[model samples]
Target chain A: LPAGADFLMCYSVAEGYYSHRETVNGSWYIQDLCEMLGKYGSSLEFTELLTLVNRKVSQRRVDFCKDPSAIGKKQVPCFASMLTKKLHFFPK
Target chain B: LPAGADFLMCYSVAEGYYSHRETVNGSWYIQDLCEMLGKYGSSLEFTELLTLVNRKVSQRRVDFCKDPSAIGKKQVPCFASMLTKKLHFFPKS
Candidate 1:
């Protein structure tokens, strides 16, 4: 396990990225971030860490690489595309 | 799309299985149900329908077939195992 400082740094980076992209109102940001993370081994590890966290807190362990592999593997771009398609059912 | 009658039948069957196994506190029920659902196309279709419903309501699109495939592919058995292991930490809070 990482120290508090190390955890905070990584947490902020991931959360910041998620928040930034979410603020931008697009999945491209998430895709870009995922692509960027794939460049390093820690990114994937961090995802696993988050999975455990979710399990600890929510009791759900759904993975990203499953059937809609794009969401987790492809990251933000896939999510953006998904959200775009989803919004169509409602309105702008 | 299935009619309400058809949906109800399928929903009852699936929910009943989930509930029965969940109530019994066993994963075999879920595993058995998944296997039974595998026997018919409608089961998978129902899952897909549920997925669509979740996405429509929650804006989340995570799928059932991604990596850690056991979670979705193996269905109840896998989830049951997961829950069992999980119960060690939190027990019916």
Candidate 2:
């Protein structure tokens, strides 16, 4: 598993330049992630971040990308609910 | 009586640089006028503009300046009511 800093750097570079791409139906679409969560990556490991993203993605609460072609194929980071509920950072 | 263009030039020059002054309580205060009315001076003559301003000033709707010293001493041009009531430029007019 990658360290928190490594995961954070990856996430930041990917989202900052829209470099993260997902292939679906033989077409490529940019994979979207929460820019806000990149701020918290230094405190979380790669596995922890994946768990947070996967749980929301599995529940249909958040999706991979807004593009229709990449639907149900990729996982996107959505940590607002996770952070608010688990970390008690922001009040509901 | 000055022509519309001359009145407009006077009104514009006076208000543009805050040069209009009035004396009250032995002290001089900057007399204030509507910046908006300056735009209409070219279309309305000096007397016409004064009539428009005086009517509003007489009704206690508008005054000479925001300064307390010149409160009731001088008349300020406030032609929003006049333009709206007499001319059909704005919606209310």
lDDT of 2 by residue, A1-92 (tens): 11210012122121212213434622121122242256545565333443344333323322446666545333222211111011212323
lDDT of 1 at A60: 21
Worst lDDT 10-window in candidate 1 chain B = B76-85
Global local distance difference test of model 2: 0.29
Docking class of 1: incorrect
- The DockQ scores of all candidates, in the order shown, are 0.02, 0.00
Please state the error at residue A49 of candidate 1 in Å.
28
DockQ, model 1, C-alpha based: 0.02
Off by over 4 Å in 2: A1-92, B1-33, B61-93
- Provide the lowest-lDDT 10-residue window in model 1 chain A: A76-85
Put down candidate 2 lDDT per residue, B1-91, tens digits, no spaces: 1121101212212111221343462211112224226555556533344344433333332254665553433322221110101222332
Please give, for residues B1-93, the per-residue lDDT of candidate 1 as tens digits: 112110111221221112222435444433444544455334333323322332332221235456343232221111001110111112244
